[PDB]
Amino acid sequence: VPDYHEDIHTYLREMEVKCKPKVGYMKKQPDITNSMRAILVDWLVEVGEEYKLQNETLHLAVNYIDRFLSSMSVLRGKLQLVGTAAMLLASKFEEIYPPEVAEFVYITDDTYTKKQVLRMEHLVLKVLTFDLAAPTVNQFLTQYFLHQQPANCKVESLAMFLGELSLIDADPYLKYLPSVIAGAAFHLALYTVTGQSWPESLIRKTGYTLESLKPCLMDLHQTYLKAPQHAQQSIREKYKNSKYHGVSLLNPPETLNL
Amino acid sequence: MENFQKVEKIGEGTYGVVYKARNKLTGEVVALKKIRLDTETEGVPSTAIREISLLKELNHPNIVKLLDVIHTENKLYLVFEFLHQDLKKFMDASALTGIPLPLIKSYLFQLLQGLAFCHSHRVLHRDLKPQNLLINTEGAIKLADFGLARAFGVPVRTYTHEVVTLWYRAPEILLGCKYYSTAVDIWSLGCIFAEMVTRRALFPGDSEIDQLFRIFRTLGTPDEVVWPGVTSMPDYKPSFPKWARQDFSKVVPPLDEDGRSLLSQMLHYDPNKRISAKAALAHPFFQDVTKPVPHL
Numbered sequence: 354v355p356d357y358h359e360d361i362h363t364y365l366r367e368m369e370v371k372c373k374p375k376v377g378y379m380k381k382q383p384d385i386t387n388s389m390r391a392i393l394v395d396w397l398v399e400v401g402e403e404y405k406l407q408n409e410t411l412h413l414a415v416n417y418i419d420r421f422l423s424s425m426s427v428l429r430g431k432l433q434l435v436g437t438a439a440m441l442l443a444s445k446f447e448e449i450y451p452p453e454v455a456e457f458v459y460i461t462d463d464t465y466t467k468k469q470v471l472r473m474e475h476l477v478l479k480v481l482t483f484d485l486a487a488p489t490v491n492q493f494l495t496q497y498f499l500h501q502q503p504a505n506c507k508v509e510s511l512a513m514f515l516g517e518l519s520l521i522d523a524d525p526y527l528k529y530l531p532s533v534i535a536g537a538a539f540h541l542a543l544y545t546v547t548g549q550s551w552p553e554s555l556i557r558k559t560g561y562t563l564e565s566l567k568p569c570l571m572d573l574h575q576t577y578l579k580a581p582q583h584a585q586q587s588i589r590e591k592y593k594n595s596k597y598h599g600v601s602l603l604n605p606p607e608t609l610n611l
Numbered sequence: 612m613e614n615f616q617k618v619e620k621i622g623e624g625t626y627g628v629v630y631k632a633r634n635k636l637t638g639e640v641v642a643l644k645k646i647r648l649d650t651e652t653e654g655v656p657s658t659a660i661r662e663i664s665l666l667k668e669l670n671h672p673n674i675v676k677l678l679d680v681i682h683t684e685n686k687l688y689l690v691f692e693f694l695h696q697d698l699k700k701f702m703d704a705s706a707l708t709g710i711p712l713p714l715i716k717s718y719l720f721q722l723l724q725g726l727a728f729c730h731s732h733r734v735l736h737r738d739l740k741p742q743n744l745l746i747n748t749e750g751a752i753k754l755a756d757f758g759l760a761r762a763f764g765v766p767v768r769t770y771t772h773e774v775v776t777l778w779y780r781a782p783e784i785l786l787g788c789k790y791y792s793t794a795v796d797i798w799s800l801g802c803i804f805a806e807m808v809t810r811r812a813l814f815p816g817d818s819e820i821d822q823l824f825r826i827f828r829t830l831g832t833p834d835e836v837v838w839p840g841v842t843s844m845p846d847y848k849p850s851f852p853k854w855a856r857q858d859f860s861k862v863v864p865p866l867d868e869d870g871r872s873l874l875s876q877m878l879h880y881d882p883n884k885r886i887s888a889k890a891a892l893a894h895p896f897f898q899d900v901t902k903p904v905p906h907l
């Protein structure tokens with residue numbers, strides 16, 4: 354039973370435009386690269402699994418990192434301190450009871466002290482101007498799922514899987530807004546599992562034609578094909594579990610017919 | 612902080628002590644919520660993280676205005692607009708005499724407008740209670756204390772070790788459902804509405820089972836017909852007594868027919884059938900809403 358789903362979906366579309374990371378930010382970072390970012394984000398996936406965190410906590414942490422790295426220059430020896438701080442803040446915002454700070458220090462193999470993590474948390478807050486309720490691919494995917502006919506567990510878990518893979522690679526996926534990635538993810542899960550397409554209901558609601566989703570749907574397809582060969586494997590392993598209906602073992606379509 | 616002068620302590624919230632203060636330069640009277648941030652704790656508390664972030668998205672006459680956040684090494688201050696007092700105090704002071712009906716209806720209308728604004732901006736308050744609702748001398752009432760407030764872009768999961776009110780807790784939460792919804796805030800506002808009218812708390816329970824039995828004995832024991840799924844909920848027991856719904860006229864006597872119709876749609880058992888904030892604002896009860904001022 355909705356009443357303001359339309360209001361919320363409108364408002365989330367306003368916010369994602371304002372809470373968007375600067376697209377070409379890694380070119381202006383002297384010491385760090387997209388490949389370093391891929392390792393950090395992948396480590397955060399393992400931290401989530403180890404501490405039984407929410408998939409949304411992950412999405413928010415990556416958004417914090419990308420926004421912080423958009424305005425502050427960071428050296429490689431401090432990139433993990435930024436990420437830990439991001440995850441601690443995303444945990445305080447989204448989890449009922451977040452892990453203690455002591456735990457966030459132990460996951461870093463005591464590279465940083467409790468002092469430094471607490472200090473970065475404060476710097477991250479200041480840089481982000483306390484704006485932590487950011488729209489995520491995970492959020493839009495949850496809304497989009499209400500337009501399934503009918504509901505399918507494999508579609509949902511597959512859509513999520515493809516949505517998380519986009520978090521690893523800034524190299525294409527920072528030019529797409531969360532809503533667009535969520536759309537590409539949703540179509541590709543639907544198509545692979547049941548042969549269905551991006552539904553008419555969502556075309557009218559979002560204003561995204563399947564054709565407008567094509568550029569993003571292409572990149573995500575390649576990623577899905579290349580996934581088992583990627584340098585980073587934490588997300589594939591995570592989605593091999595029975596709690597996500599083993600969606601990562603499934604065979605990607607060879608073509609998309611667009 | 613140099614520009615603020617602490618006048619007096621006005622209370623304690625969900626993380627720190629609050630003072631009335633004045634800007635020495637502009638003259639504006641404010642409310643300073645101070646959180647101690649030494650070295651060793653868990654850092655900036657989650658209650659502070661949520662109130663600041665959610666509250667700075669919400670700009671509306673019926674929601675407290677977070678004016679500035681002052682950020683230092685060892686303390687963090689939240690500067691709010693000052694309001695005169697809270698509802699709970701105004702209720703106790705207006706006990707026996709009663710809060711005038713027109714002021715009740717004005718207050719609920721304003722509370723519903725603030726709640727409709729929150730929900731359309733995907734914010735659950737989760738802790739609506741008289742102590743968290745603030746009033747001024749002009750007749751305004753405002754939602755406050757967003758420390759336990761959550762963003763529900765993704766469904767908000769249920770606590771269990773709780774940390775919420777009771778008294779103003781929704782039955783579906785007491786019966787063990789997995790998720791909160793915007794319906795729990797409307798349940799709270801229904802209880803407060805009844806409380807202003809009867810001059811006393813509607814369901815003052817001492818535990819979770821005690822709280823359910825207080826709801827049950829006023830609205831009847833829910834069954835599959837009024838609330839399908841209710842017998843397959845975790846904390847539901849078939850040994851629960853079978854009580855009958857009392858006539859609403861004996862629960863809130865001083866209320867007219869339009870009022871009782873509204874209150875009954877806010878205290879509906881099934882969260883899906885429970886009236887939304889938006890829908891409540893269109894209710895005939897608020898057809899003659901005026902803006903009277905309290906005797907403060």
Ligand SMILES: Cc1nc2c(s1)-c1nc(/N=C3\C=C([N+](=O)[O-])C=CC3)ncc1CC2
Pocket residue numbers: 621622623624625629642675691692693694695696697700745755756
């Ligand atoms: C826990 C809290 N959070 C806030 C509070 S209290 C607050 N209170 C007030 N106004 C007053 C409130 C009271 N009171 O009885 O709570 C008394 C005098 C003034 N005015 C503004 C605020 C800002 C937010």
